[PDB]
Design an enzyme around this catalytic site. Sequence first.
Site, PDB file in Angstrom:
ATOM      1  N   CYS A   1       0.901  -1.028  -0.037  1.00 10.93           N
ATOM      2  CA  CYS A   1       0.149   0.057  -0.052  1.00 10.93           C
ATOM      3  C   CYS A   1       1.057   1.251   0.050  1.00 10.93           C
ATOM      4  CB  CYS A   1      -0.886   0.018   1.066  1.00 10.93           C
ATOM      5  SG  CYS A   1      -2.088  -1.404   1.305  1.00 10.93           S
TER       6      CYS A   1
HETATM    7 CL    CL Z   1      -3.556  -0.653  -1.927  1.00  8.44          CL
END
Ligand code: CL
Lengths: 405, 405
Positions: free
Chosen positions: B363
């Site tokens: 992320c």
């Molecule tokens: Cl993500």
Amino acid sequence: IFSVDKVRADFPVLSREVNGLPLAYLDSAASAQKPSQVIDAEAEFYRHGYAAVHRGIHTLSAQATEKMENVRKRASLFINARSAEELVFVRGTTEGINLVANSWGNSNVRAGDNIIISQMEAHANIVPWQMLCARVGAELRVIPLNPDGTLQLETLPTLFDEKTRLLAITHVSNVLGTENPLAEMITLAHQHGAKVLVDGAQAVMHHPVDVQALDCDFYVFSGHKLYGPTGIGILYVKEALLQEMPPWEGGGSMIATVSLSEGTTWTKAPWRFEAGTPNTGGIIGLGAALEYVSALGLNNIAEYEQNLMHYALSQLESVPDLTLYGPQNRLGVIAFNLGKHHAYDVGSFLDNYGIAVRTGHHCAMPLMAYYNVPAMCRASLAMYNTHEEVDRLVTGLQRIHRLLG
Amino acid sequence: IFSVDKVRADFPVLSREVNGLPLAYLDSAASAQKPSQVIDAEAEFYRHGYAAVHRGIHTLSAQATEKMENVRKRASLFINARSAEELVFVRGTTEGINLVANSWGNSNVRAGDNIIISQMEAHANIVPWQMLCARVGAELRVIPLNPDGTLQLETLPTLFDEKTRLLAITHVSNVLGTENPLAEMITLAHQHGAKVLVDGAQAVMHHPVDVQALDCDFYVFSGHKLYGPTGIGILYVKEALLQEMPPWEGGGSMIATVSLSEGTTWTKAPWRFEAGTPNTGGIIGLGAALEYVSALGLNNIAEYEQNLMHYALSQLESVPDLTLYGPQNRLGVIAFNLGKHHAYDVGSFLDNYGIAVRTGHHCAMPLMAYYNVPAMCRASLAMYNTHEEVDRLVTGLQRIHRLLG
Ligand SMILES: [Cl-]
Ligand SMILES: *Cc1c(COP(=O)(O)O)cnc(C)c1O
Ligand SMILES: *Cc1c(COP(=O)(O)O)cnc(C)c1O
Ligand SMILES: [Cl-]
């Protein structure tokens, strides 16, 4: 058929004592107690299988991801949605309505349009629409109530027009127990090209719900009222609408690519609407709650609950000066006031007898103003409540009347 | 002092086997395992004290409401906030950043303004700001990275100006383990009248955090990384700012009055920011997680974790062709790639040995692009991990190199 005694044996809180006396929990409409099958499913997940769930490589994370998507599918079959990808995990009914109001509402309701709600809506299905109307300059129209707690359906011709973009309507009133004629209202709304969001938070535990038969565009409910954990709910959206809706919350797991120079792109629905770490524990517990309810059988639950409700209404005829609000065929809840005593006092005496009822405005102030009271009492009659608990309520109201009259 | 063996005895998942082998869970930075003290606190609440929590009249609901506000106070003391009313319950770090971006961002960032983030931010602390900048027509500026994984602080003079409204900055990088010099950066931001949001999701489990000493304006973290349940997090906001912020989600329990003819008014902060039924189970569990961590002592945790990290880094010197990313004084996590093998393959072999590490972009795609890789492996070294688990990682990487080289 149904056996309330075996069901009650699954709910540990029901053994509890309050104020030295055995608890009669008549507040399931505010939140339902949970069976140990649900409590232990969550606990066992944390004890033996816990990991992050973003299709991680390693075993625990891959298995957790699969459990979550299995619950999504089980939820979709529970409400007979056509596809699991039409369901979004939300914190609850409230967050789901806010998601629709912002993602769909901001893109489809314009200055000069109108939205229709009802006078019996809970605040969850009022405030997000008031905020939307103020954001875009639209008008909030209201279906009014009849004295018996049903909608004044005769006013619909003056409320629906070419500019009506949305009807937001409760399936079952959280105060009155009125069940609205959703299928006919949705046909009428669709004739004008309006969409329909249904607040089903008080419907999904009392009888089967079928969103294809209803043909609603949006449907929301909360896990914690369905004998499940807090912090989790379901938003259903028709695939064709959901695929066009922009994201609401931004962050990890709802993106396809993130670039600081070329901007960011979104993933597909429903995952585009689920940002950050999901409430994996809540999802596991919700799945167990659906299995538990389905094993009992919603038609068996409905039959037992309707018999209990008919018994209560018959017994409450012997309470002097009792005012009931709502229709005779109510589901789930009985709203009442006792003579001219304030609900707060009546509820305090009932609590002092070990009987939990809710008092106040029940997050439905416009409904209270329609009946010109500041507050009501509400007793919930759910699948683990008994004739004996009804008798205790009736007797307590009789004692309270004598004492305070 | 700290005893990892007694700590590990509290965590049931650590007894687990994966692929026939004993689990080495090195992915706490994605989500932490939970002690049975936390698991049972939630379970026991559901078993014996469960009710709705809106200062209801009856006993269970009044007691539940008090437990929730007690956790709010415990959380505020944990981060040394001046007042419990400066803390909002959110689903997690991601939702907390979105709350600020909409409620505060929409009212305080205008066309032509700028916001500053860093190139090491997680997507949670990027996407909501990209969405805000697109909503209001502001510019998103980026503090760039040095090769060792620290910020290029020399660029700050060209990024801060009169129009800078906000710095959003991570406390500890979830990939690199870099800890940023927050106190000095906040002094600089405040000199220009900018506010500072700190993403502390990777900081609060490694050492004490003191938001009065930091003087940040906003601070967010997630329960599930702090050995607590999913679905719950904390947003801290300075009282003077929070009291001026408009609501985000609308619905029950955040209103003062609701009227369909005279509009709606809001209650006081922090309750104005908490709509609908809270995640009461998650809150109970978070409170137990804070008590558990505080009983161990964050300075004892920090000391053990730093020793384990120094041991790992020393041992990993004997892995051929190992590339490490980030600074030598990293906290919590080790980001690495093995020769030219893809992280996905390395992680799959490690999982096959029973070792859980995370692979992919974590992320943090802009961070991956800075290092010109598509992915990395990341091993988390948390308070219940051992020298033996480090040895297994080192040996596995050695075996993988031999096999695939
Ligand atoms: Cl993500
Ligand atoms: C994981 C993490 C987040 C996301 O937190 P959620 O609980 O998933 O909302 C944000 N920032 C950092 C630094 C993280 O490590
Ligand atoms: C309780 C209820 C809500 C609120 O649901 P939450 O889980 O609190 O978000 C909304 N609508 C109805 C009809 C309800 O009964
Ligand atoms: Cl309310």
